[PDB]
Symmetry: C3
Amino acid sequence: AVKIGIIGGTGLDDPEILEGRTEKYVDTPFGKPSDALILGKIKNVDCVLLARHGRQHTIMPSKVNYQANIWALKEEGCTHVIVTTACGSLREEIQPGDIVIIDQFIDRTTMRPQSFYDGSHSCARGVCHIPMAEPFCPKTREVLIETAKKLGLRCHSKGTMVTIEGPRFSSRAESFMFRTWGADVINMTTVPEVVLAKEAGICYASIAMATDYDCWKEHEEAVSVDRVLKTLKENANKAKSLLLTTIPQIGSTEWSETLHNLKNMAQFSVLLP
Amino acid sequence: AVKIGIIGGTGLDDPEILEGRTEKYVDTPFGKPSDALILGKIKNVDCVLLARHGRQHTIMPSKVNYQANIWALKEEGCTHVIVTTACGSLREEIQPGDIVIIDQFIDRTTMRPQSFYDGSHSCARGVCHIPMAEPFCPKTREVLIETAKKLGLRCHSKGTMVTIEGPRFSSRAESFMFRTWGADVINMTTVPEVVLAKEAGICYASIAMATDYDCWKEHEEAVSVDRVLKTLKENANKAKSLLLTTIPQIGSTEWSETLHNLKNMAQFSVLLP
Amino acid sequence: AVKIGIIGGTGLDDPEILEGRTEKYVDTPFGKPSDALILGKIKNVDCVLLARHGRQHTIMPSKVNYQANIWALKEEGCTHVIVTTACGSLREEIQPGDIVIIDQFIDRTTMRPQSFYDGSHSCARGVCHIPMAEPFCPKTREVLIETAKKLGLRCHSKGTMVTIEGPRFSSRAESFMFRTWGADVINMTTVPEVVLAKEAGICYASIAMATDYDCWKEHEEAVSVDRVLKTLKENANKAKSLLLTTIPQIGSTEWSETLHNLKNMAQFSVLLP
Ligand SMILES: CCCSC[C@H]1N[C@@H](c2c[nH]c3c(N)ncnc23)[C@H](O)[C@@H]1O
Ligand SMILES: CCCSC[C@H]1N[C@@H](c2c[nH]c3c(N)ncnc23)[C@H](O)[C@@H]1O
Ligand SMILES: CCCSC[C@H]1N[C@@H](c2c[nH]c3c(N)ncnc23)[C@H](O)[C@@H]1O
Ligand SMILES: [Cl-]
Ligand code: NA
C-alpha cells in the first residue's frame, strides 16, 4: 500500500487533480499545516494534497511551516511526497516551461528550522543528523523522468536547486555566483522541505518547473511576480498531467524495500541519551 | 518635488551637513528608528538625516532596525535615500579613502528581516517578491559618479558589496572566498537596507568608503576598529562634500518617470489573496 | 599561571583525562553551560573540562550555548581553551582518524549569536567588532603540532574548517561546493565557539579529528551517525594522548605577552558610546 502526499507550489496546487475529494484540517506538534489536507484519489491511489503557500497563496516561503506540513502528511499515512515548485533557471538549456527532476540542493536559507529533533518535542526525542548525500528518492525520480518522456514533455533528468531565503529575488551578483557554484535552478522552498521528509522516512521527489531565467542574463528581461505567474498560467497543465500519469505507476510497483531502507536511515540518524 | 533621506554610517553620520536642522523622534509599525530624524536642507533641497547606528554608535549591525529606518524615511516623504557606509576593500585598486558607488550586493547576513510584508502588519499586506536585478538607482548613482569626478575624488563607478552578519570581522579564509565570488567591498549594513528601500519604492544609492583592506593580504596589517576609525577621521570630509554637492543636482532634475517606474515595480511585486 | 579549558566534542569528551576531579555546576549571564564544569589537573596544570553536547550528548549543535560555555570557562579563570571536534574530511589526504590543527574557518551557520556584546547584557557593554584574520592561537597550535609529531600521529599542520548549521549533514552539491571554496574539513561546532573565545581574550585552539569523508566521493560510502561513532571509538585515544602530552608543555612555557596581546585586541575591538 502506498499513499502519495502532494505539496503544490505557486500556481501548481490545483485541488481538481484528485477525485473523491474531502477537506481535512489537522493539527501537529509543530503547529498547523499551510492549509487543510485534501484527501482523494488518482485512479486507485490514495493521495493527500496540501497547498504549500495556503490555497489563497498567503504564506511567504520563510513563514511556511515545513515541519507541520511534513508531519501532517506523515501522520495521514503518506509513504511518498511528490511536490511541485516554480523556479528560476540558471542554465540556458533549462527554458521556462521545462520540468527539472532535481537531484541535489544548495541551501541559502537562514531562518528555518530543518529538523523535527529540536530538543523541545516529546514526539521526536534525541539529536538527529540526517544524511543528505542523496536528498531525493531515486526510484520516484526515475518514474517521473520516464513518465515525462512518455508525455513528450521537455524534462531535465537532474539538477541542483539553490534555495534562497527570500522573499526578495536574488541580485545579479548572487545569480552569477550561484551559477559558479553549480546550481541549475533557484527557488525559495526546497529546503528544508526535502530535509524534513528524509527525517520522516518519506520518499520525496520534486517536479521543478522553470518559470523565468532569474536575472543572470543582463541583456534579457529579469524575473518578476507577473512574469512567473504568466509562465505558470501557460505551463501548469504539464505538471498536472505528469502527476496524474506518474502516480498510478507508483501505485503499481513494490516499495517495501525502498521504504524499509529509508526508515532505517532515519532511525539510525537519531542519537538517544 | 524631491526629499532626500540620508542614512549615515560609521563616522559618516554628521548632522552639521544640514542647514535649518530640527530633531524629530518618530514611531513606525516596525518599532523605533535608530535615532531621531534630523530634518533640514542642503541648498533648496529638503533632507532627512538618520544615524544608522544611533548618534552615539550604540547599535550593532545585526540589531539595526532596517525596517523602521526605511519606513520612517518613507513616511516623512523621502523620494530618495542616499547612504554612507564604511567598508573593507577586497581589491588592490580600491584603496582606503576611495569611494565606491556600489551597484550590486551579495548577501551573507542570516539574522535579518528583509521585507515589510511579513504577514504580521496591516500596513503591508500580502506576499512581496521584490526584484533585485538592479538593487541601486542608476540615475542617482550616475549623479554621484559625475559629482565625485567634479570634486577630483578617487571614485570607482561600480562594485559588488558583500554584506556579512557580523559583528565579527571575516576570517582570512572567508575574505579570500569572497574575492573568488566577485565581491569588491565588504560591510555589515547594505543588506537589507537596499532591499527594504526597493519595497518602499525609494531611489536608493550608497556611497561606500573603503576604510581598510579586510584581511586578505596576509603580509599586510589586517582590519581593526582602530584602523577603520582612523581612516574615517582622515577621509569623512570626502563623503560630506560629495553629499553636499550631489544633493542640489538631484533637486534640479526631473524624477517623476523614475519614481513612477519604481512605484510600479514595488506595487506589482505584491501578491494579494 | 595558566589554566586550560577543554571543550570535548562528539565521543571526545572523556572526564577520566583529569586527575583530582570535582564537578561544578555554574550559571552565566547568557544562561547555563552545556553541563557541569569538571575541575581537575593534568600533571601540575589546572584544567576545566566541559562536554560541548552535554555528558549524555543531548544538545544539538544549533542549540549549544556557545556564549555560556565560553563565559563559564573565562569566569573559572581559563587562559587557554583547547577543544576537540569530530569532522568530515573534504580532502583525500585527510584520512579518517587523522588530526587537523585547523587555522581558519568558513562560517555557514545561520542561527547563532556570535558575540557577547548584544546590547542586552550589562557585563558586556558596547559594540564589538572582533578581528578574525587569525582566529586560532598560533603558539598553542604549534605546541599541538609538535606534540602530535612526538607521538607519531598522522596530523595536518593547517586546515580550513567549514561550519554548517546542521543538524543535517551536507548535500553532495554542498560538499562539492565547499571543496571549491577551499574548505578542508567540515563540522557543526567551530563557529561561533572560536569567535567568542577571541572576544574573551582566550588562547583558543582546536584538535579536529576526521571521522568520515562527508559525501563528496559519490563512489564511496557517505557519512552517517554510525560511521562517525565507529571512527571515534577507534581513534579517540589519539586526542586524549595529544591533550595529556600537550597540556604540561603549555604549563611549562611563558604566556604573559601572548595573553596581553589577546587582551588588548579584545579590549580595543569594543566601541563604547
Ligand atoms: C508569484 C510568485 C513569484 S515567484 C517566487 C515563488 N516561486 C519560486 C520562484 C520562482 N522563480 C524564482 C526565482 N527566480 N528565484 C527564487 N525563487 C523563485 C519561489 O520558491 C517562491 O515561492
Ligand atoms: C568602528 C567600526 C568598525 S568597522 C565595522 C563597521 N563598519 C563596516 C565595515 C568597515 N570595514 C569592514 C570590514 N572589513 N568588514 C566588514 N564590515 C566592515 C561595517 O558595516 C560595520 O558596521
Ligand atoms: C554522532 C554524531 C554524528 S556527526 C555530527 C557531529 N560531529 C561533527 C561532524 C562529524 N562529521 C561531520 C560532517 N561530515 N559534516 C558535518 N559535521 C560533522 C559535527 O560538528 C556534529 O556535532
Ligand atoms: Cl553562503
Ligand atoms: Na537566522
